[PDB]
Amino acid sequence: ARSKISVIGAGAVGATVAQTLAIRQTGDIYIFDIVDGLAEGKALDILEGAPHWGYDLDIKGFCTADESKYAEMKGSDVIVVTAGLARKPGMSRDDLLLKNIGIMKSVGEAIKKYSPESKIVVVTNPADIMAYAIYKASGISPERIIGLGGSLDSTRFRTFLAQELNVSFEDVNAFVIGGHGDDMVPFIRYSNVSGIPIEDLLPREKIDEIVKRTRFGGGEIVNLYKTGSAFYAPGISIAVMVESIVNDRKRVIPCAAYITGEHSKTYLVNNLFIGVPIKIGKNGVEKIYDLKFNEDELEAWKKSVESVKKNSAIADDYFAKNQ
Amino acid sequence: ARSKISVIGAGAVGATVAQTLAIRQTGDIYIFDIVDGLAEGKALDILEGAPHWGYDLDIKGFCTADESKYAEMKGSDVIVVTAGLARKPGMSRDDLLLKNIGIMKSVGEAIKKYSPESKIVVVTNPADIMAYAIYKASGISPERIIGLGGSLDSTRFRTFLAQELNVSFEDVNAFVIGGHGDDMVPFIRYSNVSGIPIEDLLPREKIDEIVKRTRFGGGEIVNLYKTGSAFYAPGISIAVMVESIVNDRKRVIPCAAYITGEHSKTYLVNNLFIGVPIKIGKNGVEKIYDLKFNEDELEAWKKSVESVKKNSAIADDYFAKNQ
């Protein structure tokens, strides 16, 4: 009677997604992790709060050291992919990408085997490239796969704007597309407080500072935690995407999506994932909005595109060599 | 305009409490931790999710490496104490109790200095003894201090019953008083599904199994996590206590509370904290309910009483030895 969501990865991010989905009563939640005991423990800890919170859900966790346990994903409406590494001492983010692509390949093949009907929300960073790897490995029709990106950048951008202007978080709207960091592309003219353009409220230098803080917002958290990365804001940023699919909400949120056909004319890429505004519903990507760029936005977009093309070619090379 | 809650400790439990209070919109939340960056990081990560969740709250974090930062607790309606250690099989429970009592002493001294008007919710285990230590150190009127105990044991007990009977978590009621583990005292006769006693619904053998799992429920999670203890279920168990104070809900939940006067005739302890059913309101403990014990419950209670008396005497001795 209820929708089913699987979460792959039971670390801080995946477990936060699971706890968030339970609070928001999105559906039954099954958690998966290769680490002995981890997914089972997170699921139980989350489930044990149900009598206080009020959620009547089936919440379970499984160890995938025996990959056969991936069979428990069967019937999932959405699978959230959060498995993967963060940098180890002596690892470039270039080495990290390659490592994570390999994990995506394994995960995608498991999804293909046990739950090929699911829509997929890919979280592992950079999620545009990891969504691409999931697509290549799973064979799932590409409109059914989306990557986390803009939901998180926009929530940070809104937070900073709201604090600066001393207004409710609900009334700030901050428009971003593309990736994280230098690949992020804000449309300041589309950012506002209850419709009032930010450019009518803050001077350029202040907006610039806020844009910068947003670009490096993940690193800001890493520098505070020292030994881990953000998970609270990512968790809810992911959950709002998931629930839009499960409950067919038709939220319009920038996410990493597969660009093809007429959309390639606007976004200057073809057959790749990159962050663009999408309508999210029961079928996955229900619509890609084609934006109109001014010159600054276009030049910024071109840089973002080159980074994605570069990293996607790396994923291509990996799959070509590892049948 | 909003109430203010301070959370001392920004590890898994304290930060979960903070995120939980934010979701339930309990009030502004200030987080404190001796580890540089940690409380600020947890606060920012939680705050950055505000635009998606919808909470319009001030959420801040501070480093207490210098105790002067505790000045930021000023005007807190509730302070949640989650500071303290868990050494694991290296030193005994006794060494651990002593370590934590010392932490409560310094925390309580800081509370007296910077926010002596606050109600306190003590989480550090065993919370009855740690509440007693907070009382001795802070000088706060003892009705204004409560310890986490029954809120958590009861949520676990209810989860297990509901799954065994395949019923809503909302309709299961599980009655426990006393401490954790062998110090916990269930009243099976007061446990029911929508009023129907559980003894009419399950074989005694199964009820005993569920009682034992509840006793060692925290250990069950520790085994699954390997390197840490439960935090999700404790987080909401703590938040329901905090919000009952802040919003004067008059919840009736078993918590560690100070027993004196006529209540000592019922609970056989005097001037100590122990887990009993209390009405929780804006003034802290607004009523202690005096239970009638049957013979089995009485026996079990007396054992719990001896444990609390013994550990409380250890706390007295520590305080006597340290001015």
Add this chain to the structure above:
Amino acid sequence: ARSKISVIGAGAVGATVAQTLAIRQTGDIYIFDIVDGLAEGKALDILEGAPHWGYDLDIKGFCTADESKYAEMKGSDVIVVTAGLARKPGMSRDDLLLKNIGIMKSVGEAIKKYSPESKIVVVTNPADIMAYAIYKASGISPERIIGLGGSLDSTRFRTFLAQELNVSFEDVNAFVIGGHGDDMVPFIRYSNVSGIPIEDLLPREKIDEIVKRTRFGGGEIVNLYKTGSAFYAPGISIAVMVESIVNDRKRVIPCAAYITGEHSKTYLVNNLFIGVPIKIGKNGVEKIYDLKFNEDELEAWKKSVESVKKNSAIADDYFAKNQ
């Protein structure tokens, strides 16, 4: 995509149920009424609050003057029957019973014609008899039909107890079975505050006054409104039953249910609807709990049974006369 609920009757009670289901995001909601414009108006008014409340739901209303509009019920998981008429004195309530039985016959035939797969929650008073009429008219398997009764009496009883004792409404449990008014049968021994029996907390004289107030709680509201009856508390009392079906919650709540087989040995009625504790799930009634009556409860139950047997015979006679 989403679950669908139809509400028949767009008066105060039906429209309150609709707005309640929307707020609680239970599913898409279609409203039906014979009165031109009424259901369409209630639906639009409710839908137009969606941007503030947050519910992304399809909410529509239809006039059933042309009965073919009932085709819009197709695919409903649950249908709520609130259609009915009139008052207590003035005209005879026996005359009223017959009139409402006739409306149930028409509504039941429409359901069989257009949405025979739905579970049905019957609200029209007395809902035990009206559920019986829906069953006779619709041919729907009887476990898939339940009547409002206990959910509303228990919420009133809980309210009165919580006010008297100055405790949270969440922690009061009040046990009733049977019908309304003199037909209601409280189990004082199964009523408690967080497990503590109310007999341990209030003088018997007070409990008796509260029981009497619950019996005549509907009349208390009529006395205040003058020209109408209660709708806010009924609305939520109905919605918790509906959502238990839609979301398969397994709530345990007393409702009017079809009593047969071994249950007839406990409840002394056979092949009739009467208020008993049931587990409510995606299949409708998933369990009837068989209580053990003490002498006093049994004597009260026999009276309630006699009233239901009499009125069910009247319903039988009506159907026999109009086949």
Add this chain to the structure above:
Amino acid sequence: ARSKISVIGAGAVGATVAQTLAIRQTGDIYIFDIVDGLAEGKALDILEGAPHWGYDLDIKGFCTADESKYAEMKGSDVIVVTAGLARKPGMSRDDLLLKNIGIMKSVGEAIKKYSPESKIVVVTNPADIMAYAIYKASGISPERIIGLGGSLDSTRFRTFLAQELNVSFEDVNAFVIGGHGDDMVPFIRYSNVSGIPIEDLLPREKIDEIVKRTRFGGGEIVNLYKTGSAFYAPGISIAVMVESIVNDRKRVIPCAAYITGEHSKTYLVNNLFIGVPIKIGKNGVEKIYDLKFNEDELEAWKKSVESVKKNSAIADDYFAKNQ
């Protein structure tokens, strides 16, 4: 304690506001109405649903045929004024305005007497003029009074756009200021779906249709209800204003607000209430945003201003011959 809200008027709108505040747990809610039994009945019906909904609030109702019952407003953080005269046949719009101004005088005087510290949210239509009457009658500092307008027009406009574009209600933003009907002034250029201008999504003819439907949105519901006016969407539209004050959320929403000083240079009125974007906080109006008009908007605004000047002049004339 908890925050307290008084609601004056226990008809459909006032009682809907009360039930909405309860569900949203905004604070204690006291309802007042001159008609014997009505406020008491609405309050009790609402309170009796608390055990199911979960709100632990003091909800009470009083009949103000005895004026002294207004003493029960004491300590209210916000007072919501919904009392008004139902328009009688043959009564002109100006005659209705005069009657309602008279009711605002009585209400304002009771507020001045019994709860002069309150912020006021005025609902009685037209709320700009009625806010102005409440100001004249109560002597309350005018930044502490706001009138319902744009919150309701915006929610309707958002509903229509979301349905037309098949997107989530959460992501549509519809910018309006001024009054209702022909006094409403939309800024199409500030209306968008997740930042994407609606002028990039819909052609002018479709946008015009939706603007027009919004202008006469109230009338559309009246034509469906036939015997009354909208209340569900107004209820939540009001409640979001009220909770922004009580919980100091700093929502930015167009409301009727007192225009003076520098703001008069932008809005072309002085010392009158008219609908403009405001930041709503614990002090009432925390900020008025000064918009930049194009020619169409300026001309439409001048019309809106003239209507407000004319009706405010009628109010001045009324107060001048009654004191």
